[PDB]
Every structure is written in structure tokens, then in C-alpha cells.
């Protein structure tokens, strides 16, 4: 009888609006980058929870090359984690143009990109043991006290070129920083809160 | 050495081009315009289906013109009864990322796949009454984007590994592999006789393969960008395909040639899904905008400008009997058009 | 996939008892349950029904407002409570699992049952024949007549055919005309035009000896036809 | 090397493909038009069925 | 009591100079509001909960201008009533004030609802809002309209015309009077209730919610400037709204504080009459600036 | 308007020349 079929459909609908209420708070994230980057330092899944909200991380590595055909599935991700090796120099170039293939890529012009460069300690230990020659450290950013400023100028130059290649609109914004931790999850939480707060204003016409 | 190994390559390339031009002649535009065109048609939605949770990626019709299967990024397969608009089964997928789904001709099995690199087979007529995993197809180093049931026991899958594969459900082992593609392949269609099947790759090349012989027979390179969708003409001697460069192209297997093109200056977005009607007169193609445009397969005229989806359409299909056409978009909405 | 019944026995008239059936091998939550009573030397008759999730419950007009039914999904056991028992109440009680959707096979499986002993204006159908002497080897055909047409405007009828072996649990052969059920040979076929419905058998085997029951599913007050038995 | 084998397989594939059996495009177009016009009255898309005879409605 | 040495309250110059600006504010009032409604209807992807409240506020503003302005200017040009000596005049006399009072109720409460919605989204950082009108929002707007209509009900009735005879002239004049014990209680508290419901309850509620939203938001270089800009324009909208509607209640409050008359004559009446017509223009210009402010702050609405 | 006794001419005339509210 059609009544029993309708009851079954209603039960299936109720079950559908019982896992979807647990999926709107997942706050999924996408992680991608070069092979030499510290992916394990921070399809593969990782489970971690901070401040009464869970996080879902997507470490896609089972795809051949070009990354531009399956990336359209990630159109509705809150944020994208982009990781490169700062201590490396020869492969920094196509890593920079790798970022170009994401920032300007279609179906991807609405999601922010979080830069998570590592190997700052390696860069410092290498320095201690063409556009770089002409440059100055911006006064807007204040380095922490007791920090060797031989690498500070290089880090500031890297930040400046990252911002320059990022800004080359306002619907999606890059957050370039450095890291080498227990506060990684806290930083990711703050970054997600910031991007969601920015996204809320896009609908409020504020 | 290798120096002698490319000369005959473009030698036979020029041979192919010259033979194609010799067999070609004045186009069919002056022939098709003789008959009265169908003209603009008004087509209205009949079942404003609701119930889906996330973006819809692919769908397929069963042998009967009533049952449907739909896939989405939420990791769940829903079987829809079109006539009464109620869910028949709800299959919770292990992997949330799926991009294709299919319905077996016998209606007993349902297949799906995606970024998990594994094709999952589900049995609908199990004695226990709950849909369960029948067999998982391994041995894929790239994402699977299109799968179609050759029969109740043989399946064909298109992967992202610049190749296509044929699998047997009973043994679970690969039968034949088609490695002639030099670019990422995502579109796969099968002829009504279940003897030949075409596939279009990202290299703007569509080629014909054999079920048992297992090498490419003909190759078409009339496109300019990635091929998103491909479909067979009802007759079986021709097929049509779409691309991201906003044009639809029709090819003939016997002629081994480009056979006219469908495009307009008013649309820039590429085609996502391509399907013919029962008689093949009307070609229905999706687009990345909010309106779906159908074309006359013989006149290239704008037959319909049907819209109603808040997002881009990602899947389209026409019933076997040609009674209705169902389309799905990224807004978790499915529409039935008569 | 099996059903086991408990309880039963000898109950004094006017007493109260609870009947519990255990289900295993299949998902009880997604399967609806029916209770069917079989009077000795008489035909079957529906008693009560419970839907999936306990959202819809029906009772027969004979036992309306007297018996209650409940289900327990976590421990996959069905509960039936007996309030008042009379001379006509004692019979063979069976539990049936059914699922309702397109392409489904309702009343596919039938329970073993338990033994119970004691100290209108609805649809109905009758079959003229009750028993015919036929030998194995040739085709056997029967006919049934329904007072009201079962051809729903949706497109399909709702006639079900059942098999009852002597001393064995009932089984389903044809849930709808022109589509065969699972687990039965292809020699069984049925046809109808909405008024007169017939069942044809290609060949008769020894294991096919039993009682034939006709079933309607258009109106939920299910009424079963008088049993027709075949003997060799 | 892999390049030599790939080249030989490629040239073999075009060797088997080049000959084929191709017909004039006009004949194929005429056959397609005849097939399309043969089923003109059968396709519901061109001529919608009446609501009485339509299973949908 | 009785007469006074001088009569009349308006001046000939003020009647004409304000009339053209009253027509000027009218013509810009309709096109600005009608544009906002037409984009929401035609763009076809603006059907959202936040936009539904904006559309309701804009539509409520539209019915305010198209009703209050044509009748207010006519009364100032000629000290009369449009119909006179007709039964339809009494019905029109009992309909326009009711529609205006309902219009104020929805628009004021829509501002409270908008502040509630804005604060909730900022506080609920784990909620991404998208396409479609929520059931909560859908039930809120209809309840918002119904409550304003219910509260505007005890203004439509009891608003009747009563003649007068004095100075050898007969005029058809329209006011409101109390004919029951409930009306007498409501009449003596009408100004306090209107001021309380339009200033006491909305201003404090929208101020604390906006302050809480701003404080929670501020609880790293190119984003702070955007946060300051939106915070400033959100508070500025409240500031102009309070300033615009102040003269309407200020004149009515002075009626019960500084008025039984002791030879005040037109010195007190004309000043309050003058600010009554000035204020209603100020309230209207607040309605006119409300939609164009959204266009200026963000670029999502086109024309 | 909220003046009492409907007697004084000044309030009635003011209401006649005042906007409605």
C-alpha cells in the first residue's frame, strides 16, 4: 500500500535530517602541498577536537597530477591549507606557481587559503651556519624580542611576495604566516572563526 | 635510431586528414534545412523533487522509466520513485567523495565510485532486506569518475589513470585494460548493442574501444578543451560530446569525422552532461550556468531554455522509453521534465 | 532468516497472556509485521498489523479494541498481548514479515507459529472449488472470484497467492499476477482481468501438494479466501 | 626503452586504423535523417501524449 | 478659556517652501524603495532569511510614504479633510491612521529583528548561512506583521469626526476621542506608550545587541578596517533613526507636561505644530535613507 | 489628539490644522 511506502519515505527523511545536523558543524578543511612539505607535522583523515567543535581534515594524495579536475569537488570547503617548504629554494618557484594554480582556479575563487610554511628552524640554522638583495623590512610587522634579524628580512620578503601573488579581490583572502605545535589547532580554530565571520558579512550586505 | 620513428607518425596523420577530407563533402546544413524545424518548445517541470542533502554529482535511470539512483558528496545513495516521489532505499556510503553512479540493466545492482579509488557494488534484492556492499573493486591508482553496467555480471569503469578498465563481479578481477588515453578521461558511454563504447578525455580526444578486442579503433580530436560528457546516439552509429569550451560536437563512427557543431555566442560556460532523446532528434546538454539549454541534433537550433536550478547542473538523463528527462544540479534539487 | 514463536499452551477462557516472537537474520526495524490466525480445518484470517517504527497500527474488526501489538527494535522481538479468550479465539497464530515499496515482495516469509488451546460491509472473495482429484503430470488450473475489483487506479492489482504444506509453515508463490516471487519454480503463473482471477500450473509435483489461499491487499481489513486443497 | 615501445604501439594502432571502411558523409547523413523521420510520430518529446494516455498524469 | 487675541498657527511661506521638498522627498522615496524590492524579486537568488527581513522593512517603508505623504501635504496646503460630508470619509479617517501605525510597528520591529539576526550569526560562528528562507525566519515575519496589526487595532476605532461651531464657521475636522473606560485609560497613556514602544524598548534593545555583537567580534591587518567600517555604519543607522523620530514623540510628550491652558495662545501651539510637520519629514527621510544606506555600505545590490 | 471635554476651541482647531498621529 502507498501509505506504508509514504511512512518508509518519511522515516528515511527523518534519518536524513539526523546525520546532516551532525555534518553542518564538522568544519571540513582541505590540505595540499608539495611532497617535501611537513604534511605529517601538523585520502587521509585526522581526528582532533578543540573548544567543543570537531575538525575534519582532507589529505588528498592519491591523485596523479594537475590537481585541477577533482578540486571542483572541494567547492564548499570552509578553508584550504597550503603548505610549502620555506627552507627549500630551488623548488620554491614551481611551488609559488602551484599557489597560482589554486588562487585563480575556477570553482575555487570563494575559499580562503591558509599558508602554513614550516622549516623556519631549518632556515635559521642554514643562515647561521635576485630581489632579495634590494629589500627592506616593513615597520608594520614587529618581530619578537631576542630574534636574529638575518632571517627576518628573508621571511618578510617571502611574506611580501606571497601577498603580492595573492592580491594579483575581497571575496576570498589569503592568510600568510609562518610556523614550526600544541597551538596549531588553536591557530586553525582562530583562522576558521575569522573566515566564517568574514563570510557572514557577504550575505548580510554589510 | 629513434629519429626514424616519428616520420611515419605524421605521415599517417596526413594520410588520415587527406582521407577524411576526400570522404568529406558539402555539409548537411543545406540538407537539414529542407524539413520544417521543431522550433521553440515550452517544457514545464512536473516533480519538484526534494530530500537531497548535498551537491548532486551524477545519476542514472533504470531499465524501467520510473526508478532513479542519485549520488552526492554527503556519502549517501538514494533510490527515487519518480511517479510517487518517495525514497525506496538509502545506502550510506563509506566514502563521502563519489562522482558517479549507475543502475544495472536488471535492476538488481547499483554501483558508485569517486575519489576513494574503489568501485562499490550494492545489492538491492538481498534476502536480508537491507542494502549491503556486494563487492569492492580495487586496483585503481586514480579517482573513478564514470561506471556503467555492461550486464548483470560485467561492468566498465573510467578512472583518472589515463585508462579504462573492465571488471567481472563474480571474480572481482580485471578482464581487460584500455591504456590508449594520454589525458584524464571522465566521460564514458555505451552503445545500445553493448558491443562498442566511447570515452572522451581531457586531451580533447574521444575514441572508440572494443569490449573483448581491447584496443582503440577510431579517434576524434575536434574538441579544444577537456571533454566532460559523452553519450551515444539511439541508432548507435554516432555519438555526441560536450566540453568546457562551450560547444557540443557530434561525431559519426562510420564516417570517422566531425559532423557539425552546436554552439552560440550567448553562452560561455562549458557543458557538463550530454544526453539524447529516444529518437535522437533533441539533444539535451547541461551547462555551468543556472539555465539548461537543449539543442536540435540536426538543426543546432535552441529548442529549449528550461531553467529552475539555483546552481549549475551536474547530471542529466533521459528515460529509456523517452517519457521524461530528469536533471540534477548542485542545489540538492532534482527536476522531472515532461 | 527465521521466526520463532513462544508462549501458547492451554489458557482458561477469559484469561490474559502475552505472545512474543523472535526474529533473526534480517533487519526487523525496516520490516513490518502481520499476525494471521488459522482456525483448525478452516481458512486463514488476518488479526493485527504493526508498521515500521510503530507509527501505524491496524486491527481486524473482530478483535478491534481488544488486542494490542507492540515491537521492540533493540531486542528484535515482537509483542502481542491477549486480553480475553473465547471458544472461537483458539487457532493457529503466525507471524509474517513484509516490506512495502516498488518491486517489493510483501508476505514473503512466514513464521513457524505457536499452538493455543482453550478450555462488516468489507471486501471478500470466494472460490467455487474446494478440492479436485488431479494426478501429477498435467497442468492444473484454478479460478477465484472477487466481489469488488482489486485493480487499483495506480496500475497494478493486489492479489497474493499462498502455499500451505500439510504440517508446515505457509509460503508465498505469487505476490502479484505476471511477476514471480523468489524461491519458487517458473511453472506457477497467474492472470486476471479484475473480476475473475485464475492460477495455472505447468506441472504438478509431489512437493506441491497443499492448500491454496487467495489474498487481497487493496483494503487493509485483509480477508483470506476459503482454502482449496489438491491431492493426488 | 619505454619511448620506443610506445612509438611502435602507436604506429601499429594507426596502421590498423588507417585502412578501415569509410563511406560518403552524405549517405550517412541521409540515413540518419531517414531514421529520425521514421520515428517522428513515436517520440513523445516532439508530440506530447494526451493526459488521458500519459502514465505520468 | 474662549478665544485668544490671535489665531492660526501656520505661515504662508512655510506652507509652500516645505511642500516642494515634501514632493521632492516623495519622488525619491518611491524610486529608492521600489528599486530595492524589484532587485530582490527579479535577481532570483536573493531569497534568503536576512533578505526577507530587508524586503519586509523596505516594503513597510514603501506603504508608509505612499500613504502618509499624500494626505499630510494636502492637509497642510488646505486645512481640511479629503472627502468631507461623506460616509467614506469616516472610513478613510479610520483607515489611514491605522495603516500608518501598523507601518511604524513593523518597521521598528524589523530593525529589532535585524539586530537580533546579525548578532546571532556573529555569536554563532559555527553556523554557515545559505540559500532559502528558514522556517524560524518565515514564522517570525508573519508574527511580526500580526503583532503590529494587533497593537494598531486600538487606533482605527474611536477615530471619528466631530463637528464644531465657533466664530461663525463650520468645518469638518478629524481627531480621536474616548467613548469608554478602556479608551479613557488608553488615551491618557497613548503618548507614553507610543514613546515607550518606539524609543524605550527598541533603542536600548538594539544598542546592547549591537554593542554585544561588536564586543564579541573584537574579543589581522586588512580585516580590522572592514570591521570598523561595518561597526560605524551599523551604529550610525541607529543614531540617525533615534534623531529622526525624536521630534514626533517630543511634541506629544510636551502636550501632557507643559500645556490646562493659561493664556499660552499660539505661542505654545504653533511651535509644537511646526515641529510636528518638520518631524514627520525627518521620519520620512530616515525611511528614504534606510535602503540607499545598504547600497552604499556594500556592493551586492546592483542599482 | 488627547485633549479633554471636547470644548476648548484651540485644541480642536490645532488638531484640524495639525498632522494626524
Author numbering:
A (entry chain A): 8 to 49, 182 to 268, 278 to 316, 319 to 330, 333 to 358
B (entry chain B): 8 to 345
C (entry chain E): 1 to 119, 135 to 247
D (entry chain G): 6 to 62
E (entry chain R): 66 to 284, 294 to 333, 335 to 378
F (entry chain L): 1 to 21
Sentences from the paper on this structure:
Endothelin system comprises three endogenous 21-amino-acid peptide ligands endothelin-1, -2, and -3 (ET-1/2/3), and two G protein-coupled receptor (GPCR) subtypes—endothelin receptor A (ETAR) and B (ETBR). Upon binding by agonists, ETAR primarily couples to the Gq protein, while ETBR couples to multiple G proteins, including Gs, Gi, and Gq proteins, to transduce signals (data from GPCRdb.org). In this study, we present cryo-electron microscopy (cryo-EM) structures of engineered G protein-coupled ETAR and ETBR bound to ET-1 and ETBR bound to the selective peptide IRL1620. Globally, ETAR and ETBR adopt the canonical seven-transmembrane fold and G protein recruitment manner.
The structure of ET-1 bound ETAR and ETBR in complex with engineered Gq heterotrimer were determined by single-particle cryo-EM at global resolutions of 3.0 and 3.5 Å. The extreme C-terminal amino acid W21 makes an H-bond with K1663.33 and faces hydrophobic residues V1693.36, L2595.42, W3196.48, L3226.51, and I3557.39. I19 and I20 are buried in a hydrophobic cavity comprising I1362.60, W146ECL1, P1623.29, F2244.64, Y3527.36, and I3557.39. In addition, D18 forms a salt bridge with R3266.55, which makes a polar contact with D3517.35 and further S3256.54, thus constituting an extensive polar interaction network with TM6 and TM7 of ETAR. These structural observations are supported by the dramatically decreased ET-1 activity on alanine mutants of K1663.33, R3266.55, and D3517.35. The side chain of D8 forms an H-bond with Y3336.62. The phenyl ring of F14 makes hydrophobic interactions with L3447.28, L3477.31, and L3487.32. Residues on ECL2 of ETAR, including F229, Y231, R232, T238, and M240, are also critical for ET-1 activity through association with the α-helical region of the peptide. Compared with the α-helical and C-terminal regions, the N-terminus of ET-1 exposes to the solvent with seldom ETAR residues making a minimal contribution to ET-1 activity. Sequence comparison of ET-1 with two ETBR selective agonists, ET-3 and IRL1620, reveals that the most noticeable difference resides in the N-terminal region of peptides, in which all replaced amino acids in ET-3 from ET-1 are bulkier. This sequence difference elicits a hypothesis that ETBR has a larger pocket space to accommodate the bulkier N-terminal region of ET-3, which is supported by a smaller pocket size (1976 Å3, calculated by POVME31) for ETAR relative to ETBR (2059 Å3).
